[PDB]
Amino acid sequence: GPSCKHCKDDVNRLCRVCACHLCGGRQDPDKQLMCDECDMAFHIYCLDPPLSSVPSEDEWYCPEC
Ligand SMILES: [Zn+2]
Numbered sequence: 001g002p003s004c005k006h007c008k009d010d011v012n013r014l015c016r017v018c019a020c021h022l023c024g025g026r027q028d029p030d031k032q033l034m035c036d037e038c039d040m041a042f043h044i045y046c047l048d049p050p051l052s053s054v055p056s057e058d059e060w061y062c063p064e065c
């Protein structure tokens, strides 16, 4: 127990560290990206520009990187 210290897995709270690093929402994992060199996660639709769908180039890098 617990995998993330910051929100303490409290699904009722937001977390940019363990969840979507922009909205901090936990929905739609299928639609989240992990920046291979920042390791945080991103809703394809929270991006800018936002992506209509996941990239195929299975190695993604966040806008922070
Ligand atoms: Zn957290």
Ligand SMILES: [Zn+2]
Pocket (backbone or CB within 6 Å): 020, 021, 022, 023, 024, 025, 042, 043, 045, 046
């Ligand atoms: Zn988001």
Ligand SMILES: [Zn+2]
Pocket (backbone or CB within 6 Å): 035, 036, 037, 038, 039, 040, 061, 062, 063, 064, 065
């Ligand atoms: Zn990154």
Ligand SMILES: [Zn+2]
Pocket (backbone or CB within 6 Å): 021, 064
């Ligand atoms: Zn950041």
